[PDB]
Amino acid sequence: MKFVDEASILVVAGDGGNGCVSFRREKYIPKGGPDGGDGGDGGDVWMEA
RNA sequence: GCUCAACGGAUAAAAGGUACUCCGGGGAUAACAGGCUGAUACCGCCCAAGAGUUCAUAUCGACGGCGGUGUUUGGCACCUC
């Protein structure tokens, strides 16, 4: 409705993902290897006019 | 006269590979899976300094605490060689 300027906003970018320390063990492979997926990129805050 | 030190000392005198392998056995001993547990992982809850212009609890919520699930990373090796 009315016109009010001088707005303030707090925005935080998404924190980046966390990898996991995991090892691969299969039916016949006791020593498979370090098998841990990487994390995901954090969220990004944008501006639109 | 022995660092015969692997110290009740198998010879005075001896290192490795096998995915080309083979035999006898073991779940006495691994891995997958089941089972037990729940540190860790996930979820929820407790208090609330603070941010939220005046207002902790609209939404977040720092230092910590308490549980659930069996659900990732874990530990044991009870069943199956």
- Scanning every strand, the nucleotide with its C1' closest to A26's CA turns out to be B32
* Residues of chain A immediately before an interruption (C to N > 2.5 Å): none
Categorise residue A40: left if φ over 0, alpha if ψ from -120 to 50, beta otherwise.
Answer: beta
> Which residues bind near strand B, taking a CB cut-off of 7 Å?
A 10, 20-23, 25-30
- Scanning every strand, the nucleotide with its C1' closest to A27's CA turns out to be B32
DSSP one-letter string for A3-44? ----------PPPPP-----EE--SS-S--EE-----PPPP-
Residue where the block lists tokens 């063990």: A25
Obtained via which technique?
cryo-EM
Is residue A35 within 8 A of residue A25, CB to CB? The reply is: no
Separation between Cα atoms, residue A22 and residue A24, nearest integer Å: 7
Strand ranges, E, within chain A: 23-24, 33-34
Separation between Cα atoms, residue A45 and residue A31, nearest integer Å: 43
